[PDB]
Each structure stands twice: as C-alpha cells, then as structure tokens.
C-alpha cells in the first residue's frame with residue numbers, strides 16, 4: 001500500500017501518495033482544482049486535479065462518475081486522458097475524495113496567442129491538433145459544447161490537448177459558443193464544436209476576438225454581420241416565438257466575403273473559415289472533413305488520425321441514488337489500469 005501525505009493547497013488539505021512531490025497550484029478545472037507535481041516513479045511532470053465535493057449531491061456524484069468514466073476512455077494524443085486516479089480512502093465506506101492525474105501542460109491557448117504574432121504554419125499546427133482531438137471525441141458520440149481557448153491545454157512545444165469536454169448535463173465567456181448552443185436552439189449536432197474552432201482560428205490569425213459580444217443579443221448581431229441573415233429554415237430550430245420574431249425583424253444583412261475580413265491571410269485559411277463559420281449546422285464541415293482540407297496538407301496523416309473505441313453512455317439516462325454513483329465511481333477508481341509510459345512507435 002502506498003504512503004500518503006497531507007499538504008494544504010488552495011486553502012484545503014490535499015492527501016496524495018508520496019509518489020507525487022512538489023505540488024504547486026496551477027488553477028481551477030471543471031468541478032475541481034489542479035496542482036502541478038513531480039511523479040517520482042517516472043520522473044515525469046504531472047497535473048493532479050482534486051475534485052471539489054465529489055459526492056455532496058446527486059448532481060456532484062453523477063458528474064464525478066461521468067468525468068472519471070470519460071477520462072478513463074480517452075486515449076488520444078490531443079485529448080486529456082489519465083495517467084492515474086487515486087483516493088486516500090481505504091474502503092468504500094471511507095470514500096469521499098477523488099484525484100485525477102494527467103501529463104502536465106503548462107499553458108492554455110490564450111497563453112500562446114497573447115504576446116506572439118503566430119505564423120501561419122504555427123496556426124495550422126494548433127488548429128490541426130484541435131481537429132484531430134475533436135475527430136476522436138466526436139467518433140465516440142462525445143461533444144464538447146463549450147470549446148474555447150481556456151479549454152485547450154498547451155505545453156512548451158505547442159502540443160495541445162482538449163479538456164473539459166462532455167461535461168455539464170462563475171461567469172463563462174460565450175464568445176466561442178455555437179449560436180445553436182448560446183441561444184438554446186432545439187436540436188444540434190457535433191459540429192457545434194466546429195463553430196468554436198472557427199472562432200478560435202480567426203483569433204489566432206488576426207490577434208483579435210472574432211465575436212466579442214457584450215450579451216447574447218450583441219453577440220448574435222456581430223455574428224450576423226459576418227455570416228449574413230439566415231433563412232426562414234433556420235427559424236425552424238428556435239422554440240421561443242419572441243426570439244424568432246426578433247431575429248426575423250432584423251434588417252437583412254448580406255454575408256461578408258471572408259477574404260475582405262481576414263486581409264492578408266492564407267487563402268486556404270480563409271476557405272476553411274468559410275466552411276466552419278456557417279449558421280446551418282447541417283452545412284458545417286465536420287472535424288474529419290476539416291483534417292483533409294488543404295490548409296493542413298503539411299500535417300495531415302490519415303494513419304495518425306484515429307477514432308475512438310465505442311463508448312457506453314447508457315448511464316446518462318439513469319437516475320441512481322448518491323451511494324450508487326459513489327460505489328460505481330469507487331469501482332472505476334479500483335479498476336483503473338495505468339497506461340504504459342511509452343505508447344507510441346515510429347511510423
């Protein structure tokens with residue numbers, strides 16, 4: 001059995017195996033807070049997330065199970081996955097704390113673009129990696145729904161991983177959210193995340209936020225100025241009569257030619273943005289299709305753009321008692337198998 005030690009971090013006690021040393025806070029994550037650490041077993045740097053009150057309510061308990069199940073399933077170089085999961089509890093009866101461990105990523109995407117005019121080749125690499133991660137999660141019927149620069153972890157070499165996907169069943173930015181999500185439209189698909197990629201890519205190319213709306217109405221008006229007024233077919237998706245009447249009442253605006261908006265950008269980048277930033281979600285390019293776009297020609301490699309194993313989400317439709325979610329979560333902690341340190345081979 002491993003020996004644990006206690007340390008106060010972010011004003012609360014963390015209890016971790018002695019394997020993990022030099023814990024230092026690196027910010028909050030979804031439903032928890034994160035510390036960087038040194039893994040003395042492998043000499044690797046890791047990030048340890050302590051979930052906040054994982055079993056306080058049925059909402060917390062199911063979200064704890066959801067996150068652990070998802071992260072145990074994700075095995076892709078552009079998606080956050082698990083090196084370890086632990087609890088100081090010796091039994092289910094004692095079980096009240098869950099810690100998740102992944103490879104340390106020092107920054108988020110806001111740290112990459114803030115003080116650096118990115119080259120086009122570098123933007124290609126960043127967006128390529130997002131799309132590769134999205135192809136993988138979407139292939140398991142998992143959608144992010146709130147993709148944004150602060151949900152993209154990046155290391156010192158610009159390697160990127162998607163995180164905080166598949167969650168949520170504090171005031172957040174809405175500047176990157178798909179219109180169908182921001183406005184609660186009745187049905188949507190995986191391409192909500194592609195809208196977000198378009199917003200991110202636009203900002204990496206120009207250094208400016210594409211749609212910096214002050215509220216949901218101002219954000220919609222900014223979007224429509226770029227993409228033009230939608231047809232009546234799009235109203236089909238909106239439940240609220242007041243919202244439909246409002247949108248319908250707006251003066252007709254033509255779509256802008258993106259070449260006149262992103263002056264000086266690679267024409268292939270402009271073409272890709274035109275395919276991502278479409279209001280018709282059935283018309284939006286998918287992640288897999290975007291990976292084949294000529295903008296990524298120097299990075300694209302079909303042998304290294306894998307899909308996910310099938311993911312059983314049947315638990316999502318079930319209402320269970322708190323102790324049932326807790327026991328299921330405990331089972332998943334105990335059954336976790338750490339991956340090999342080296343899981344890759346030369347092409």
Ligand SMILES: Nc1nccc(-c2c(-c3ccc(F)cc3)ncn2C2CCNCC2)n1
Nearest residue numbers: 026027029034047049100101102104105108
């Ligand atoms: N520094 C770093 N490195 C990797 C991941 C994270 C991380 C996690 C997280 C998720 C699962 C897990 F098992 C361990 C940690 N959740 C939020 N963050 C963020 C902390 C600050 N914003 C950027 C990443 N932070």
Ligand SMILES: CCNC(=N)NC[C@H]1[C@@H]2C[C@H]3C[C@@H](C2)C[C@@H]1C3
Nearest residue numbers: 208209210211212222225226261
């Ligand atoms: C922070 C800087 N970003 C912006 N001012 N974005 C809004 C503009 C862009 C999106 C719509 C079409 C064009 C291009 C004109 C506006 C509205």
Ligand SMILES: [Ca+2]
Nearest residue numbers: 300301304347
């Ligand atoms: Ca390759």
Ligand SMILES: [Ca+2]
Nearest residue numbers: 077157159344
């Ligand atoms: Ca490597």
Ligand SMILES: [Ca+2]
Nearest residue numbers: 342343344345
């Ligand atoms: Ca290897």
Ligand SMILES: [Ca+2]
Nearest residue numbers: 301303304347
């Ligand atoms: Ca090959």
Ligand SMILES: [Cl-]
Nearest residue numbers: 073310311312
């Ligand atoms: Cl599974």
